[PDB]
Design a binder for this molecule. Structure first.
Ligand SMILES: Cc1cc2nc3c(=O)[nH]c(=O)nc-3n(C[C@H](O)[C@H](O)[C@H](O)COP(=O)(O)OP(=O)(O)OC[C@H]3O[C@@H](n4cnc5c(N)ncnc54)[C@H](O)[C@@H]3O)c2cc1C
Ligand SMILES: COCc1cccc(NC(=O)c2cc3sccc3n2C)c1
Lengths: 670, 133
C-alpha cells in the first residue's frame, strides 16, 4: 500500500478503522461522530508514518505536531493522547533509537524480567525507556536465547532462528533499519535426491517433482475441506490430528483408484455377456442354416417337371433360407462392433495406482518439510487449528541474516541491567510485591534474591512444562494457566552445521533436498542449506526423527550426513569437515524444545490464556482487590504471531505497555 | 468451497473408513479381492467366447444362395395362384414372405390377391388352419 495508509498496514493496523485496543483508550472518540474518528485515524496513521520514515531516532510529541496541517494540528490534546498511546504500545519509538530527551533523572517502579530472549530484551528496553528500573535474569552466558549464532573465524551460522518471514508488516523491518542486519534473499528452487540402496542417488525429474508437490498441496487443501465442510474433528472422543486426516484422505484416494478399476472391468464383462449371448444365437443360426440348406438342396434335386406342392417346397425353403442368411448378417455386424467396443474399453483403463512407492517417498519429503516448519510430527498438530496464524502472514520474500541473527538481541541488550549466569529457581508474588530467588549457574549454592513491584516471565513454554518443575511459583499458578501449558504444544527441530575449507556443492544453489527410504525416518537430514562465501552447509532434522537424533552422537550424525552428500556429489569430492556443530534443543534445559505449535486439543485461545497475567490473593482477607503482579511474554503468548522472533518481540512490547499502564498510570485517557 | 479437483471425499466414505481401528485396510483389501475375482471372471468368458468363435469359423458362405431377381410381373398365372394359396397356408398374413416365395408379385398385389380370390380359394378356412399351429 501507499501513503499514510501504508504505515498502518506496515504497523499491522487497519488504516480505515479503529481497533478494540484503541476503543479501550479512546471511547469518547469511537462512540462519537464519524467525522472525529477519521481525524483520529489520520493522526494515528500520520504519526506512524513519521516514526517509520525515520526510525533510527525518537519521535517526540512536538516533532509530530510540527508536521501536521489543519484541521489535524488544531486539537492538540488528541494529538498528544494519540502520540502517547502509540509510544506506550511500542508502535513508535521501539527497538534501537537515538534519544532526543535524555532519560528521567529518577526511576519509578522496579521490575524483574526473567530471560533475555528477544521477548524479554524488547520489553526491558521499553520499560526502561519509560523510566522504570529493570533488571533481567538470564541463566545462559549470553543473550538471545533461541537466537543462537555459531561463530568461528569468518565461519558464521545460525543454530537458532534464521529467517525473517517477509518485511511486509513485520516489525523486524523497523529493526533491520535500526541495525545493519545484513539481509539476504532465499532462492526458492529446491532439487531432490533419492537414494538407491547405495547406488548413486538420482535427482528427481521436473515432471515428477512438479506433479508430487501438487498432489501434496492438493492433499492439504483436502484436509481443510475435510475439517470445515465435513466437520471431521473428533474421533473416539479425541481430537483429530492433521497427520490423522492426511492418512484418511490418502486412503480415500486409493479407494477411489480401485472403485474406478472395478467398475471398468465390470463394464468389460457386462459386454462380454452380450458378446456371449450373441455368439450363442450365431452358433444356433449357423446350425439351423446348415440343416435348411441341405433340406433345400434335396428339394432342389427333385428333377422337373414337378407338381406344384414340390415346386412350392423349393421356393418356400429358398425364401426361408434367405430369411436366415439375413439375420445372421445383422448379428455378424453387431458382433463386429462389440469386439471393437471391447478393445476400446481394454485400451482405456483407469489409473493403475494412487501413488507408487517412489512417489509416496517423495511425498514423505514434502511432509517432512512441513514437520520442519511446524517443528513437530503432523500426528500432533491440531487439524482444526494448525494454520490459524495464516491470515497474519507478512508480505515479501523471506530473508536470512547473513551476518548472523545474534546481532539483534545483542544490539537490544545495549544499556540494560543483565545478570547472566543467573538461573531463576522460584517466583514469589503477593499483594505487597514479588521476590525472585535465583542461583549462580556455575556454583549453584551461591543464591540471589531480588525484590520488585512486578515480575515478567519470558520463560519458554518447554521450561514452563518441565515435570518436576524447574521453576516454582509461590503461590502456584492457577488451574487455568497450568491446564493451558499442559495443552499447548512445544515442538523441536535441530540443525547441523558443516564447516569446510572448499566449496564442493553447487555455489548457485541455495538449498537442496534428500529423500531417504522410509516414512519412519522422513525427517532425518531431509534438507541442506548453503549461504555465504563461507563453505558452510547446514543439514536439518525434523519430525519424529529430530527427537531421536538427540540421543545419537555428533560423530555418527556427521557421518550419516557425509554419506548422504557423497551419494550426491561423489565419494572423492566430499572432504571431512573442519568444524561441526549439532543443536540439541529439546535437551537444552533453557528451552526444553524449539518452539510452540497448535497441539491437537489446543486452540488459539490458549495462547491468550498464556498472556493473561496473575493477580495474587489479598494479604489481609477482606482487604481491597490487589494489583496484578506476575506477567507473561514470549513466543507462546502471542496468538497471531506464535513461534517466531517478531512474535516474541511483539509480546515483549505488549507487556511493557500493560505494566507501564499499571504502575505508571495512563496519561492518555487524562 | 468443494473438494480439490479430482480429490474424492464423500461424507459416507469418511464415516466408513474411520468407523473402526482397521476398517481402513479392511475396505482396501475387500476391494483387492473383489478386483481379482472380476479379472478371473473375465479370463473365463474370454476363454468361453474364444471357443464359440472357432465354431463359427467359416462364416456361412457354404450355405449362401446366389441372388435371383426377375421383374415384378402383373399377371396372375394359375401356377402362381397355387404357390400363393400354399404360401398363405404356411405363412399366414406375412405378405412380405409370401411375395418373396412367389417371386414376381409385389406386396400390394399379394394384398389385393387376398381380397379378390378370397371367395374362391376359401382363404378364411386356410388362414385359421395356420393359426392351428
Ligand atoms: C531451531 C530454531 C529455529 C528457529 N527459526 C526461526 C526462524 O527461522 N524465524 C523466526 O522468525 N523464528 C524462529 N524461531 C523462533 C524464535 O527463535 C523464538 O520464537 C524466539 O527467540 C523466542 O524468544 P523468547 O524470548 O520468547 O524465548 P527465548 O528466546 O528462549 O528467551 C527466553 C530466555 O529465558 C531463559 N531462561 C530459561 N530458563 C531460565 C531460568 N530458569 N532462569 C533464567 N532464565 C531462563 C533462556 O535461556 C532464554 O534466554 C526458531 C526457533 C528455533 C528453536
Ligand atoms: C520460503 O521459505 C523457505 C525456507 C527455507 C529454509 C527455511 C525456512 N524456514 C525456517 O527455517 C523457518 C522459518 C520460520 S519462522 C518460525 C520458524 C521458522 N523456521 C524454522 C524457509
Amino acid at each position: 500500500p501507499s501513503g499514510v495508509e501504508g504505515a498502518a498496514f506496515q504497523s499491522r493496523l487497519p488504516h480505515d478503522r479503529m481497533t478494540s485496543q484503541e476503543a479501550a483508550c479512546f471511547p469518547d472518540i469511537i462512540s462519537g461522530p464519524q467525522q472525529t474518528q477519521k481525524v483520529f485515524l489520520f493522526i494515528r496513521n500520520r504519526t506512524l508514518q513519521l516514526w517509520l520514515d525515520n526510525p533510527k531516532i525518537q519521535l517526540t510529541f512536538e516533532a509530530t505536531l510540527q508536521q501536521l496541517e489543519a484541521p489535524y494540528n488544531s486539537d492538540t490534546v488528541l494529538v498528544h493522547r494519540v502520540h502517547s498511546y502509540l509510544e506506550r504500545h511500542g508502535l513508535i519509538n521501539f527497538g534501537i533509537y537515538k534519544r532526543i530527551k535524555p532519560l528521567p533523572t529518577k526511576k519509578t517502579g522496579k521490575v524483574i524480567i526473567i530471560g533475555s530472549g528477544v521477548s524479554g530484551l524488547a520489553a526491558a528496553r521499553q520499560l526502561q525507556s519509560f523510566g522504570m528500573d529493570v533488571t533481567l535474569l538470564e541463566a545462559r552466558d549470553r543473550v538471545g536465547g533461541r537466537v543462537a549464532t555459531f561463530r568461528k573465524g569468518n565461519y558464521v551460522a545460525d543454530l537458532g532462528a534464521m529467517v525473517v518471514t517477509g518485511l511486509g508488516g513485520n516489525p523486524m523491518a523497523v529493526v533491520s533499519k535500526q541495525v545493519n542486519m545484513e539481509l539476504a534473499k532465499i532462492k526458492q528452487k529446491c532439487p531432490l535426491y533419492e537414494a538407491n540402496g547405495q547406488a548413486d542417488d538420482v535427482k528427481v525429474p521436473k515432471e515428477k517433482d512438479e506433479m508430487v508437490e501438487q498432489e501434496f498441496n492438493r492433499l492439504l487443501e483436502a484436509t481443510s475441506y475435510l475439517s470445515h465442510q465435513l466437520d471431521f474433528n473428533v474421533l473416539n472422543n479425541k481430537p483429530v490430528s492433521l497427520g490423522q486426516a492426511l492418512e484418511v484422505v490418502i486412503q480415500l484416494q486409493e479407494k477411489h483408484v480401485k472403485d474406478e478399476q472395478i467398475e471398468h472391468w465390470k463394464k468389460i464383462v457386462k459386454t462380454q455377456e452380450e458378446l456371449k449371448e450373441l455368439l450363442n444365437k450365431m452358433v444356433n443360426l449357423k446350425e439351423k442354416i446348415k440343416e435348411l440348406h441341405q433340406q433345400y438342396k434335396e428339394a432342389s434335386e427333385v428333377k422337373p417337371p414337378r407338381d406344384i406342392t414340390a415346386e412350392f417346397l423349393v421356393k418356400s425353403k429358398h425364401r426361408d433360407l434367405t430369411a436366415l442368411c439375413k439375420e445372421y448378417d445383422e448379428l455378424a455386424e453387431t458382433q463386429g462392433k462389440l469386439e471393437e467396443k471391447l478393445q476400446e474399453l481394454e485400451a482405456n483403463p483407469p489409473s493403475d495406482v494412487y501413488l507408487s512407492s517412489r512417489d509416496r517417498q517423495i511425498l514423505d519429503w514434502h511432509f517432512a518439510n512441513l514437520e520442519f516448519a511446524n517443528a513437530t510430527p503432523l500426528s500432533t498438530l491440531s487439524l482444526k487449528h494448525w494454520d490459524q496464524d495464516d491470515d497474519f502472514e507478512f508480505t515479501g520474500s523471506h530473508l536470512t541474516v547473513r551476518n548472523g541473527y545474534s546481532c539483534v538481541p545483542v544490539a537490544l541488550a545495549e544499556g540494560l541491567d543483565i545478570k547472566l549466569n543467573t538461573a531463576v529457581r522460584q517466583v514469589r508474588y503477593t499483594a505487597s510485591g514479588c521476590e525472585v530467588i535465583a542461583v549462580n549457574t556455575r556454583s549453584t549454592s551461591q543464591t540471589f534474591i531480588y525484590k520488585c513491584d512486578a515480575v515478567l516471565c519470558t520463560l519458554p513454554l518447554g521450561v514452563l512444562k518441565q515435570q518436576p518443575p524447574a521453576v516454582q511459583f509461590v503461590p502456584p499458578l492457577p488451574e487455568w494457566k497450568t491446564s493451558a501449558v499442559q495443552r499447548m504444544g512445544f515442538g523441536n527441530l535441530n540443525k547441523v552445521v558443516l564447516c569446510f575449507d572448499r566449496v564442493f556443492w553447487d555455489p548457485s544453489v541455495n538449498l537442496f533436498g534428500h529423500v531417504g527410504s522410509t516414512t519412519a525416518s522422513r525427517g532425518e537430514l531431509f534438507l541442506f542449506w548453503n549461504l555465504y562465501k563461507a563453505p558452510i552447509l547446514l543439514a536439518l532434522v525434523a519430525g519424529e526423527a529430530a527427537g531421536i537424533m538427540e540421543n545419537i552422537s555428533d560423530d555418527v550424525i556427521v557421518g550419516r550426513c557425509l554419506a548422504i552428500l557423497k551419494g550426491i556429489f561423489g565419494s572423492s569430492a566430499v572432504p571431512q569437515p573442519k568444524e561441526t556443530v549439532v543443536s540439541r534443543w529439546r535437551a537444552d534445559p533453557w528451552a526444553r524444545g524449539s518452539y510452540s505449535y497448535v497441539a491437537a486439543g489446543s486452540s488459539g485461545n490458549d495462547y491468550d490464556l498464556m498472556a493473561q497475567p496473575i493477580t495474587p490473593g489479598p494479604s489481609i482477607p477482606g482487604a481491597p482487590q490487589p494489583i496484578p503482579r506476575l506477567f507473561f511474554a514470549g513466543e507462546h503468548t502471542i496468538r497471531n504471531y506464535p513461534a517466531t522472533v517478531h512474535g516474541a518481540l511483539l509480546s515483549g512490547l505488549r507487556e511493557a505497555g500493560r505494566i507501564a499502564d499499571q504502575f505508571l498510570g495512563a496519561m492518555y485517557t487524562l | 468451497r468443494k473438494p480439490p479437483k479430482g480429490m474424492f471425499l464423500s461424507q459416507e466414505d469418511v464415516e466408513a473408513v474411520s468407523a473402526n481401528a482397521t476398517a481402513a485396510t479392511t475396505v482396501l483389501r475387500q476391494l483387492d479381492m473383489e478386483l481379482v475375482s472380476v479379472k478371473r471372471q473375465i479370463q473365463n468368458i474370454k476363454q468361453t467366447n474364444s471357443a464359440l468363435k472357432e465354431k463359427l469359423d467359416g462364416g456361412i458362405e457354404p450355405y449362401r444362395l446366389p441372388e435371383v431377381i426377375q421383374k415384378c410381373n402383373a399377371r396372375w398365372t394359375t401356377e402362381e395362384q397355387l404357390l400363393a394359396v400354399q404360401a398363405i397356408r404356411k405363412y399366414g398374413r406375412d405378405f412380405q414372405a409370401i411375395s418373396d416365395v412367389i417371386g414376381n408379385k409385389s406386396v400390394v398385389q399379394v394384398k389385393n390377391f387376398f381380397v379378390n380370390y378370397r371367395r374362391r380359394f376359401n382363404i378364411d378356412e386356410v388362414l385359421q388352419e395356420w393359426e392351428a399351429e
